[PDB]
Every structure is written in structure tokens, then in C-alpha cells.
Design a protein around this ligand. Sequence first.
Ligand code: ATP
Ligand code: ATP
Ligand code: MG
Ligand code: MG
Lengths: 574, 645
Amino acid sequence: SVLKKLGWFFKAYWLRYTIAIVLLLAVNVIEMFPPKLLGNAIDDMKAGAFTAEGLLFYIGIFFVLTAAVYIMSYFWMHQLFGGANLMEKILRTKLMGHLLTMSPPFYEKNRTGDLMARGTNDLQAVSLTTGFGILTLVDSTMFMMTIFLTMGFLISWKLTFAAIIPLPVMAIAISLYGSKIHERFTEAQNAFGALNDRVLESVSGVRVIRAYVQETNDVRRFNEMTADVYQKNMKVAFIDSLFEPTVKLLVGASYLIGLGYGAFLVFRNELTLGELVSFNVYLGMMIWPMFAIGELINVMQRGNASLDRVNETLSYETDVTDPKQPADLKEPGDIVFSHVSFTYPSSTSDNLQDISFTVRKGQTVGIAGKTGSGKTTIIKQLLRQYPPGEGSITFSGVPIQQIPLDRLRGWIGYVPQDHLLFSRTVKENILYGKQDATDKEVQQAIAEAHFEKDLHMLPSGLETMVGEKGVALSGGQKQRISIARALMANPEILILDQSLSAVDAKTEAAIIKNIRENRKGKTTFILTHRLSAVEHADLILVMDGGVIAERGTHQELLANNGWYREQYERQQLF
Amino acid sequence: KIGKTLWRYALLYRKLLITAVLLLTVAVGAELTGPFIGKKMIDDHILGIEKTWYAVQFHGVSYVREDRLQEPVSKAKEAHIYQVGMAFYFVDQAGNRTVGKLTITNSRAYAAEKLTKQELFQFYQPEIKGMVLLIALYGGLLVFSVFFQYGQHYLLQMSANRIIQKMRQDVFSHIQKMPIRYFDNLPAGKVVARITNDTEAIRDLYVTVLSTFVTSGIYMFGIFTALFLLDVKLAFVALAIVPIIWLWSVIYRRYASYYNQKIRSINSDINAKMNESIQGMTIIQAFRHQKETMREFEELNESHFYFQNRMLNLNSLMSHNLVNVIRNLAFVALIWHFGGASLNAAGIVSIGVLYAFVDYLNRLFQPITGIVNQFSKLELARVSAGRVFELLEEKNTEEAGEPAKERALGRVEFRDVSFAYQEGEEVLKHISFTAQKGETVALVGHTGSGKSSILNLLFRFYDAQKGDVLIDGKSIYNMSRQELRSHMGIVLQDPYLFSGTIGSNVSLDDERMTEEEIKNALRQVGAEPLLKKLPKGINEPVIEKGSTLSSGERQLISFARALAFDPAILILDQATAHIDTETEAVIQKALDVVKQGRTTFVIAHRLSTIRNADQILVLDKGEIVERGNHEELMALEGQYYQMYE
Ligand SMILES: Nc1ncnc2c1ncn2[C@@H]1O[C@H](COP(=O)(O)OP(=O)(O)OP(=O)(O)O)[C@@H](O)[C@H]1O
Ligand SMILES: Nc1ncnc2c1ncn2[C@@H]1O[C@H](COP(=O)(O)OP(=O)(O)OP(=O)(O)O)[C@@H](O)[C@H]1O
Ligand SMILES: [Mg+2]
Ligand SMILES: [Mg+2]
């Protein structure tokens, strides 16, 4: 299976290992002559015919054979150990190529530590298997095959069908051991994924842990998990230590049968002491290296399980998010929702009911209602991060699909309600939006989200390193970097998702004033809970559960009695 | 010193390793006694025909060997048997092997007849008895080292597993006793790698590398002892061999250390970078940075590939390829010494000894093939030990007093205090304020004046450089931060929900609140548990944060868990930002009123939620401006309040 799964790599490179199989045959035969040479030499010594020139011939043959095997197996080592590295690298590239270009509904079903390990640990295991396991398997198989052939013709077939009797038992034992070790190793790989997940969770949540004083209550859980992992490690140690004795037993049985029956053959005069020594050396080289057979199966089944994990993660069908047939219409200004009955993958109810939303040309639309009413669900309908069940964004006539995700994603502005950054300088993560921005538009977006003053606090303006996540930055600063970054693009469609909830009222005034200046005839989706930036719009939809309670602008809402009617006054009387 | 710590962890388990080595010593002793049976079967039951003969009867005359079945005391002929080619000859009465013409020039000549085949077979019937005896002897001897090998393997497996468990536990405890700064300035994947992807390197250093090393070192010692038993001159070269392996371990180290450490560092970078990409995959799939992140990754991947190829040559002139050069040099010596002994026909003594040594060479190299296969892992795990050990041996750590203290009055106080991250950014300057049981709220519009800096200074996440913080006159530098952090609770500005049910998230895996803490959820959560199909205890939110839940709902759960714990001081950080919906934000301040039971620090950028506070601060630019209440509004807070309405 691991061979049938890794073959396509070899079918891609059958110029590098074809040269290496012939090379291994050569180095095995040349290194397999010395046994018979020694048998002949000792036979000559016993008869008293050992002559000086024979010693010179023997030592010369030994030296030349040693040099030949040295070099001509150095090439075989280099080739195969390089092939393993190449396999690992290409698999890693494929794995990250599949992780990308895949919508967010898979990250709820797939872990960040399971995937991180499924890259690093799984690929190092597959590399170790590709190199060392295949090396040993091919070498040992062909070596045993040829040793069984040479002792047959060149010594005898009775002495060699007789130490072969115990090898079928070896085969059945090797079958059972692998049959168990495969399951054990798939479990071990999943367990490493789980361990990485737990450590990642603990590391990410540290202030929440320290502020609550549960260091000890977490070292307890880690200790229990490590104890369970030890228990599993010993449920496999039991089997591995019950396997080795049968291996060594059978090796010793083959040795003893060969030795005794060869002595008996010598008694019948069908074989000589030189031939006895040769056969014993042949068996010693053939069957005694089997002590590493258990490690070979360990490597080969660990690799099989790791590669099965990689394969099952590497083909997931990437959800429903893909251009079917590019419609190739540059953005119509109309976004007309006809009937949208949507149901998240991890839900059993229609989270969104039929919503007849409609926004024409450039019109700020305000969507703000009870929490949990799914306004960011409607927004996610636009971005097509989730499969469409009944959604009909209907850009002009054409539905949401039939658009390039590159172009559709270029139309949208951004949807970061929770703040997100990357470990770099503030300049670089502002440049992170659009096509690397430009020379001075960075400063424009800086002193366009009322963020210029902040640079005084930062010791190195636009140059100080932004720490991992939000380290070295306050919450309002980080949101003000997000707005700047995503205003670098001057999007035709802008989506604000509670983008003003992490800064003061005074700076909120600057943003809305500067957003009013920036947004003139460009459609904007304002989602907020501060019911003041929603005052200006052609339409304001108040969201209640899966349905919009009321529709209108800032005026009729204060006329019709409803959610918006009571929410504005309370924020006004303050 | 890496090796000393490895030895100490090993010595934590002495019984296990000593018993295993003793059992394996027994097994190897049995196996090494093994080949003497081959030696003494050759020299006796095959070469007894070649020694003098004074029962074996062919033709009805010839007598029997001196030591053989049916031994009366009788010697009349002193006959002998000699080997010529594939034929044997029988001389009746009292060298060279030239063919009824047998000559021993050393001269006298005698007559002998060919022993045919059936008559030759007739000779070794007693030899058949001896062969079956010895064969059965060794066959029985095998099953004793059969149950010794099993025992020693199953014992080393426990020794390795226990060692790795202990090391992992120690590392985890140490990382939890590290300062927050350490985590602040290091990627999560980088630290995570040093715990999970780095200790696996040290596990293999124990499970297979060192276990195989001791087994091979136990097999080699026995083999050299047996070689000394047989010969004392060829055993001296055998002893010389080991310094070769020492020089094979020194060279593979002076040539693998740098590249192995580079590979490990690149692997840490690759774990960190992959974590970062997974976390922020929405900015990759919404701002079309996919190709640039792929390019960065591929840069790291090709660097790792290059260093691995910077090691692809050292491992190629090593291992079995090079283990076969010692094997053939052993064969050459076994030929040369025996030849220099047999030039004058003095080589017939070591015909079973020759076979024993020939078998011994086959013995010795397989342990060596085991040893060489781990030097790649040995020098790789030396790096991993250093990275983990440096973490385990760290002097900037903070001793933690685990015990939590009792309830304390809600008395917070701040003297002239001057905090600065990285010694240059003076966040706070001369901050001084007090509270007894009322709501003291810190407000600033500057957005970078250090509100959260004050909050995390109170928790001693970072140590202040000036002044002192005293709760009930208790300097926070009394350490035991578990008592300092148990008196008080925080709702983080950016909440982080853990995995498992929302009830588990509120409970936080503590055995203090029973299932009937729904009141905390029902305190401020309206119909959300009714919205979601099952109650708190049966719905598991998506692992890590509740991406299946909204930001406001996550913040609701975080605030509930802050209230689920009952702190003497309730600290909040923009606790009502993403749940600002006033229908529920008013239930958190109307039905969940702070009341006098708590001393609460309400932080927020909206004046509505702090209108009833009895102490308001400005702390602009790290310096305070106003100390009055809501109605004490003249100039600065007036501006902020006016725009809100
Ligand atoms: N990944 C998801 N899978 C399934 N359901 C989800 C997912 N993310 C969110 N939900 C559900 O969608 C509901 C509606 O969307 P959401 O609450 O994010 O918008 P919202 O009402 O503005 O939130 P908020 O008021 O907190 O700002 C959430 O209450 C939650 O139950
Ligand atoms: N680890 C750190 N190292 C250095 N400077 C930091 C670090 N964390 C925060 N800072 C910076 O030090 C100052 C502390 O301000 P703080 O983080 O408390 O913001 P804040 O006043 O609470 O603002 P807001 O609530 O509006 O975001 C800011 O300049 C902030 O960006
Ligand atoms: Mg929302
Ligand atoms: Mg802040």
C-alpha cells in the first residue's frame, strides 16, 4: 500500500532509481564473491596447498572488491537519500498548495495543530520511510534472493531448501506484526496531532490561564494525557517485544538447521569444510541482518499511516467555492438580494430567511440589530466563504457565482470584526492589502484613519516591529491598522464590520468624517452597534434572527415603532 | 552540558536499565557460547578420523578410535586415517598427501586403500550421536536467551517511555513558570515546536538510538571477550577496531553539527510560519496574499531542502557502505594471520578456531550496522537536547507561589509609578489613584496612553520600574502571583475562548461551580442557548475560539466566566465592545449590576457605561488629568461626552 501510494513519485523519476537498482545488484554480487573465495582459501590451507601467490591474489581481490563496493554503493546511498528529500519537499509544497485556495468551512472540521503536525511530523516520517525503509527493503530482499540462489547452485539445494523451512513462519509473523503496527502508528500520528493541539491551546491562552490561576490545573491535564500516551506506548511495547523473540528464535533455528544438516552432509561426503564455512558465512550474512526487520516494519508502517493522513487531507473537494464559468462582467453597482435561505454547515436551522435586500450603484447601507441576528452572515454571503444553499446575490442579473474569486475578492473591501495582523512591521502589514500598495498611499491611509499621532508613541514610526498577533500594539491601534490596510485598496465594495468599536468617540468622529470623504459614490456596508454612523444611507436594515425586522433609512425608522425606534433614543438621552 | 542531564534522567531509572542490561548479558552470553558448539563439533566429530587410532569395524578388522563407543583397552596396529583430495586413506601400521602409495616425507612409505562412500559413512555413527547431542543442547540453550531477550526489550521500552514522559512534564512545568514577556516576543508555533516537535527528537534518542547503542555495546563486549578466549594476538587488532568507531563518531559530529542545528532552526521557523498562516487565513483568502505567503514558505522549504542536501553527502560515505570496508579488512586479516601461521603446515590446529572466528566476524558487524544507523539521529538529537535544555535551564524565571490567598478588601492603590516596555517606551508616568469599593474607571481618547498597560501591571504580567502597587497595604512584590491573581478577575480586551462546551468555557475546568451556573449565562445572555439547538453542556463550539459563535457571543461567554468566578476585584477591558447591543448591554448593567459586592475597574471607550462611576481618570499620554466624577466635567471629558450624543 505504501508502495502503491508512493509509486507515482517513482514513475515520475525512473531514471534515478533504475540506475540505482543495477548499481546495488553489482555491489551485492561483488561483495558476495568473498565468501566462496574464503571457503576455497581455507580448503587449500587444510590440504597444505596454501601458496604465497594465492595469498597475494586473495588480498588483491579483497582490496579491489572493497574499493568497488565502497564507491559503487556511495553512489546508491547518495541517489536514494536525495530522492527521499525531494519527495518530502514536493509533498510539503502540495500540502500547503491544498491548505490555501480552500474556504473556511474546513478549519472547523480540521485542526491547526493537527494540520501543523500533518505537515512537519508526517512529512519527516514519510521522508525517513522513502529513504531508509525503501533502501533496506530493496537491499535485503534482493540480497536474500541472490544468497538463496548462490547457495542453491554453488553449494547445494538440499542444504538450502532446509534452512528455508523456518522462513514461512517468519512471513506469517511479519504479516501479523505489520497488521497490528499499522493501526498502532495511525493512532500514534493522530495522538501527536492532539498533543500539538493541546500545547498550542495552552500557549495561545496564557493570560487567560495566569489571570485565573490555573497553571496547576493545566499541568494536571497534561500529566494525565502523558500518562495515557505512556500506556499506549506500552500497549505497543508489549507487541514489539513479543515479536522480536520469535524473530530471533527463527533466525537461530535456521542457523542451527543449516549447521547441523551441513555437518551431516559432510559426513556423507557431499560437502567439505571449505564449503561448510562458505555456507555458514552465506547464512550469517543472509538471515542475521533480520534483527532489524522489526525496525523496518516500524518505519514502513509509520510512513504508510502518515502518508494516508496526508492523502486524506490533501483531497477534500475544496467546498463549493470555485469559479464555474467566468461570467466576466465588471462589477455592476447593483447588489439585489431576491431570496436567501442559508444554513451554515454546523447548524440545523435556516440561519438566514428570505431577505429582499437591494443596494444600487454607490450607497452606504446600514445593517445593525440584535446580536446573533446574522448580519455578518449576510456579509459572508457576499464573500462566498460558504456554500450557497438558496442565496441569490444576483449582482445585476448574474448570480453570485460565475465570477473570478480573484476579481470578486478584489471588489470586496474587508470583513475583520475580530482583529487580525501578522508578525512584521506596521508598514509591511499595512502593505499586506491589495498589490503591495504604493509609495505614499501608506502615509495617506495612515493620516486618513487619524493614526498619524500614534506614530509619536511608537518609537520607530512605520518602522517599529509589530509583535506576533497584537503584541506591541493597543487594541484601537490594531483596528486602525486594519482600516488603513484595507483602505489602501480603494475598493469598489467596502464592508465595515463593527470597525469603530475599539476606539474612542473622538477618533470615531475622525474616521466617520474621513470615511465620508473617502466614500462618496462607492457602495459601503456599514455594520456597527454605535447607532450614529448608520444615520446616513439610502437603506438601513435592522436584523432580528434570520429575518430583517424593518427596512428604511434613518428617518422612517424613528417613525415606525420597532427596535431602531427605542435604540436611538437611549443612546441619545445619554 | 547536555550529556550530564541525559545521564541524570537515565539514573532516575536505574533499576530498569540495570535489570535490562543483566538480562541481555545473559542472552548474549548464551549466544556467544553458541559457536563453540560449532567449533567443537568440527574439531571432534569431523576431524576425529584424522587423529591416531589404536567399535568402528569395516572389513571386520579395523579397530576403533581411542575415545569412542565400545572402548576396551587394546592397541595393536596404531592405525591412522589421512585426507587426500576428496578421498581418504587408511594406513594400518605407524608430511605430504601424495595419493597403495602413501608417503610422509616430513621417507617411509606405506599402503592404504580408498574408504569408498558407505564404509566412510560407517565411521561416523558415534559422531552422529555426538552431533545430535550437541544440536539438541544448543537448541535448548536458545529458549533461555529467548525469554531473556523478551524481558530486556520490554524493560527498555518502559525505561525510554518513562524518561520521555518525565522530560516532557518538566519542560511543560518550566514553560508555565516563564514570564509573559517570553511569550510576547516569540511566535506560538516556535515555542510549541520546542515542546512537541523538539522532544520527539529526544524521545527517539531514547526509544531506539540509545537502546540500540547499549544492546550493540553489550553484544560487542561479549564478542571481544570470546575472541580473547580463542586468540590473544588477533584480539588485540579487534580491540584496536573500537578506536576506529570512536573516530567514526567524532568525524560524523565535526561534519554534522552545524547543518543539523540549521535544519532544526529552519524547522522551528516552518512550524511558526505555518501556524501564522493558519491563524490569519482570512486575510490570505480576502486580500490575495496567497502567492506571496506561498513564496515565503517555499523559501523556507528550499532552505531546509538545501541543508538536508548539505548533509546528503556525509551520510553517503558512512553506514553499511563503510561497515562493509571493516568487514572485508577483517576477512583479509583472518586470511593473512592464518596464512602466516600455516606457511609451515602449522594451520591444522585452528580448523574449528578458523570457523569460530569466521562466525565471530559475522557476529560482530551486525551490532555495528545497528550503531551506525543512529549517528544521523544522535547528532540530530544533540541539537534538540540543547534547545530543550536551555529552556529547562533558564535563570530569568519567576518563582511562583501556587497557594491562593483568601478574600481581600477591594483596596487598590498606585503610587508614583513609571512603567516602560523595553526600557524606552515610557507608557505610564506618575500614575496614582485609589479605590475602596466603588467603580474606578480609567478613560483616555489617546488610544495609546496605557490603559491596558495599567491593567497588566496590576496582574504583574510585567514588573513596574518605579513606585509600588499595594492591595490592603500588600505590595504586589510579595510574589505568589496566584494569590494576587485569585483576588481579582479580568475580561480581556480580546477574548480567547477555549475548546469544549460553552459551559466548559464558562467553568474553565474548575471544580468550584456546579452545573447551575447557567445563572451567569442567563445573567446577560438572552435566548442564545434557546437559539442553539442544545443547552450549554451538549453543544461543543468549534475548537479554539468559537468561530461557530459571533464575536459578541464569545465576549458574552468571556464576561460570564469572569463573573462565574467571584473575584474581590472585577477588572474589565472593553467588555461591552462587540456586545454593545444596548438591549443586552443594558441587561449587563441593569440586571447584572456591579453592586457593592465587587470592586470593579470598568474600562470602555463609550461614556454610556461609565456614567455612574464614582472615579474617572484620563491618564492621557501616561499622565492623569482628571480625578472627579461624571458631574465634575469642565473641559476634557466634556468634549468626549458631547460627541457621543
Ligand atoms: N461558522 C459558523 N457556523 C455556524 N453558525 C455560525 C458560524 N458563525 C456564526 N454562526 C452563527 O451565526 C449567528 C449570526 O451571525 P453573527 O452573530 O456572527 O452576526 P451578528 O448578529 O452581528 O453578531 P454580533 O452581534 O455578535 O456582532 C451567530 O449568532 C452564530 O450562532
Ligand atoms: N508589549 C509591548 N511592548 C511595547 N509597547 C507596548 C506593548 N504592548 C503595548 N504597547 C504600547 O504601549 C502603550 C500602552 O497602551 P495600551 O496598550 O494600554 O493602549 P490603551 O491606552 O489601552 O488604548 P486603547 O484601549 O484605545 O487601545 C501603547 O503605545 C501600546 O501600543
Ligand atoms: Mg456580528
Ligand atoms: Mg487598549
